[PDB]
Structure 1
C-alpha cells in the first residue's frame, strides 16, 4: 500500500512540465522525520489530469510497481494524496532533473566514459527488475533522473535513477502508442498486451541511442504514419554520433523479442570497452 499524505502538509509550487495525462510540479512536504525532527522537504508532485481520472488505477499501479521493490537506482515514492478530486503521487525531488534535458544542455561536456557509466547504471537497474520479473514498460531518457553530476576532481561518477513508467501502454490510446515509436517495440504496436520483459530490452536500446545522441529524439522527424511504416519495413535506427554503442543498440532493438539479450549479457558487453 501507499503512505497517505495529508493535503495540508503539501504546498504546490512551480510547474515543471507535463507527462502523459499528468501535470508535474515542484513542492514542499511538511513532515516529522527521524528522531521526531520536523522537516520541510522538497518533493516532486505528479497530478493526474481531472479529465483522465479513469486512468487513476494505472496511474498509481505504475508507482506501486517501483515502490514494492527497493533499490539504489530506483526513484523513491513518498506516498499519495487522494485528498479531494485530485490524484497526486508524491516522489523524491532529484537535484538535476531528467537525463534527456541534461544531455542536450551539456552536449559539449559529456564524453564516452560518462555515457558508459550511465548506461551501466541503467543496465544494473534493469537487471534488478529482470531478476524480479518486473516489467517497467516505459524506459526512456525522460524517465531517467540525474541525482549527482560527475566530479572529475573527486573522481566521482554521475549517479542516476530510473523513474516510474507512468500510465501503462496496455491502456493508452493507439495514437499515443504510435507517437512513442521507437521506444514502444514493434510487437507492442501490433498488440499492446504483448508487453513483456523483452519489451524493456528494446526500449533500453532506444534509450542508449538517446544517451549517445546528445538528447536528440530518434525518428522525431517522422509522423506517426511514417513511424508505423518504419516498423513495417523492419528498419533500424542510424548509428549515433558517437558510434561506440551502436552495435549494442542494434542488438537490443531486435525485431525478434526472444533474441534480445539478457541484461546480464548487456552488462558484460558494456564492461568490455
Structure 2
C-alpha cells in the first residue's frame, strides 16, 4: 500500500533526465505534516508512462515491496500519484545525488576509508534485504545516493541510501540487460528468470568496482556484442585503481552463483580491511 498524493499537491520544477523507461524530475510536495503544519517538501518524481503497462506494474511492485521495509540505508518513498496520464513515484530528494556522479565531480579526491565506509553501508542494506529474502536487482553506483558528506570535524562519515529497484530485469528488453553488463550477472543474461538473491551479490561486486574506480563505468569501451563475449570467456574485471577491494570484488563476481559469499561474510571481510 502506497500513500496516495493528490496531483494538486505536486509541483514540477526541474526536468533532470531519464532512468530506464522513466522520466525524472525535481519538484515540491505540499503536505500536512506532523503537528498539522503545512510543509513544502523537496521531492524526486519518477514518472512512468501509463501506456507501458507492464513496465509500470513491475516498477511500482518493486517500489512498494521495498518500501514495506523501513531501513536507514533504503530510500524513503512518500507515496504515488496515479491521477494523471502517468504514474508518479514521489520519493525523498537526496541532496548530493548519485555516488558515481559525486566521485567524478570530486575528481576521485576521497580516501580509501571513505570508500570502505560507503561499501559497509551498502553491504548493511544488502544484508537487511537478504534477511528479508528480497531481491533488489539494480544495484549500481548510480543508485547509491549520498545523504550527507563526510564531516571531518565531527568525525561523521558519508551516509548513503540505496534507490528503489526500478523495472525488473525479468521484464526488460534483452538489449537493456546487455547494456547493463557487468552489473547484470551472467546467469541472468543466459535467462532473466535466473534472478535470485545471488544476483545482488554479483552486482554488489560491480558496484564496489565503481566506488573504487572514481565513478568510471566498467567495460565502457565494450559494445554489447563484446560484453557478451566477455562473459563467454569468463573474464573478470581489472583490479580497480584503489586495489584494496579487488579480492572482495572478484569473490562477489563469481561465475558460480552458489559460491558468492553471504552479505554477512562480505561485511566481515570489509571490517577486516
TM-score, normalised via structure 1 length:
0.98
| Contact preservation (8 Å) 2:50, 2:56 | no
1:152 & 1:244 partners in 2: Cα distance?
A: 22
In the alignment, structure 1 residue 42 sits paired with structure 2 residue 37: no
Cα deviations by residue, 1:88-126 (Å, 9 ceiling, x for unpaired): 000001110111100111134211000000000000000
What is the SS of the residue equivalent to 1:154? coil
Query: Does residue 191 of structure 1 match 2:194?
Result: no
CA contact (8 A) 1:66 1:75 kept: no
Q: Tell me, which stretches of 5 or more residues in structure 1 are unaligned?
A: none
**Aligned residues of 2:49 and 2:56 also touching (Cα < 8 A):** no
1:50: how far off? 5.0
1:15 to partner: Cα distance: 1.1
1:178-224 Cα offsets, whole Å, 9 max, x none, are 00000000000000000000000000000000000000000011000
Farther-moved stretch of structure 1 (105-114 vs 157-166): 105-114
Matched residue of 2:153: which SS?
Answer: helix
Question: CA–CA distance in 2 between the matches of 1:58 and 1:149?
Answer: 33
Report runs of 4+ in structure 1 exceeding 6 Å deviation: none
Once the two structures are TM-superposed, the CA of residue 54 in structure 1 deviates from its matched residue by 3.6
TM-score, normalised via structure 2 length:
0.98
Equivalent residue of 2:122, what SS?
helix
Equivalent residues of 2:144, 2:161 under 8 A apart: yes
Cα offsets for 1:56-79 (capped at 9, x unmatched): 101101211221111000000000
1:96-175 map, 5 Å? 96-175=96-175
The alignment yields a C-alpha RMSD, in angstroms, of 0.9
- Separation (CA, whole Å) in 2 of partners of 1:242 and 1:84: 47
